[PDB]
Amino acid sequence: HHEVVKFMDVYQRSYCHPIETLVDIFQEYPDEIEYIFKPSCVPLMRCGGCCNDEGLECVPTEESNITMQIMRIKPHQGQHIGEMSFLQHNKCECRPKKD
Amino acid sequence: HHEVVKFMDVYQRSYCHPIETLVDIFQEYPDEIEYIFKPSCVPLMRCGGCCNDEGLECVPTEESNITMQIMRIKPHQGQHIGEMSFLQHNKCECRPKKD
């Protein structure tokens, strides 16, 4: 254990901001099931944590694309390296919940 | 945008390992509903990403506790600082899925 953490630090580090998060390829690309991806996930900068109030929601305000190298494989066939671009979050912000 | 990321880097950084992840307090403590926490979430080192095969699963092998400072606030009442301990993941590893 690292003892009791400082209050001001828990809020600053937890407040809705862009943090390193791994996203599943199968979750973003639902039309790619026959080609096993290696790796099956990719690291993307997304917004995570919580808001200041219960009636708010941590969501992104800006976006961007990032190309990556993925090895697509298929049973009883072969393998191959391809270029895949994913969407990331550039800016984060809290806003009142809708649905 | 930056450019096409290196393959060896996407796998080494995406492979099931301990990464900074924010956990919701309400998700861990389902009994504390009458006392709103500030912040409502806390940063904990958990395992995230994906495994080498589809039949595997990224899960932790070891654990630990971490104390933090949280401000409990109740409607029409007052506020107060308390010590809350959360569970984190020390070691991560991939194993065949069960359910």
């Binding site: 809020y11 708010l56 912000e93 809290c94 | -």
Partner: peptide, 19 residues
């Protein structure tokens, strides 16, 4: 210094005291 405590902004100490 007055009352510029935005709900969707870094609630400093003063804002926390008067939430």
């Amino acid at each position: 210094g007055g009352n510029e405590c935005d709900i969707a902004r870094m609630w400093e100490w003063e804002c926390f005291e008067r939430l």
